[PDB]
Amino acid sequence: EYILIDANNYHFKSWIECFPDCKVNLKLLLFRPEWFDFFKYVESKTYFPQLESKLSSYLEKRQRIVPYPELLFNTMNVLPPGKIKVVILGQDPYPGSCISGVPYAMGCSFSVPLNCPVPKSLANIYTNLIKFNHMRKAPKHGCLASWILQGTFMINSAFTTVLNESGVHARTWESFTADLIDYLTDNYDDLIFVAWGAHAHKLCQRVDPKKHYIITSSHPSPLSVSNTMTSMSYGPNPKKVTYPSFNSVDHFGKINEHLKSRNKKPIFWDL
């Protein structure tokens, strides 16, 4: 109900409606207790001061931060750490809004609220599922709530941006994301990391490649979908390697085949 969002039933508090005192507290936006161990680690670190303060500056200035605060840790409040089966990193959240003014950004990577236009990179995800028979027809909407409930940890590495602006908070969110990723690879075992594009691939370099399964390809954005992607392998001895184009990889099949093999429930992808 925090992940099943609809832009014809959208009255989530704005950032400023959330903190008219421009002092930003992030503690408050995290509801689920299983993330408390992880958070209080991050709270106990150098940057969380700067982070909250850097975020406050934005409010002051006064820039419309997206997603809205109740949506910020959407995926986390829905999914406890021990129940996530797959990590799928986005980079920037969606920058745009519905004509009503409802933002596309909804706290978890690649998803949009119900009755919101579907951005092409998500369309390309649907095309891929259809290609490999995990889906018969593309859904009318782009809300991925169903996947997240089944253990798909879908998060952007930049948790916020500014409405109709891109990339503006990638670096202020950098430390926090590496700490989240470290936390997942250190303290849990058979996770599936999906690296779509160079940057997700870079983040998955911190993943222990013998605890966890990694799927790697180009990013589903229109300019990348059909192209390969080149960087270093994950090993102790990295070689320069080309990874396959997004549309050529059975991502969700590979996810499920692995899950089955470890006696876990596969994820139902169709919508």
Partner: protein, 83 residues
């Protein structure tokens, strides 16, 4: 939104930027031919009237200096314009 204004100015299209990615100079080179001096943001819009992806390529935030414009058809063919 100046970013869609640039797109309008170049193409006559009035469009909504729906998504972005940040690309390393070397990734750019493989798609565009010319190699940028630094990271570029790909600002992606869709135009259903012609069924093409319209992508404006700029420098990183906050400068957003236009560098190139790509118009891509249904088949994935790129028309590349330098800015």
């Amino acid at each position: 939104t100046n970013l869609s204004d640039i797109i309008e100015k170049e193409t006559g299209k009035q469009l909504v930027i729906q998504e972005s990615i940040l690309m390393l100079p070397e990734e750019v080179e493989e798609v565009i031919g010319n190699k940028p001096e630094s990271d570029i943001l790909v600002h992606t819009a869709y135009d259903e009237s012609t069924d093409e992806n319209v992508m404006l390529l700029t420098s990183d935030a906050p400068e957003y200096k236009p560098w190139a414009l790509v118009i891509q058809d249904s088949n994935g063919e790129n028309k590349i314009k330098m800015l």
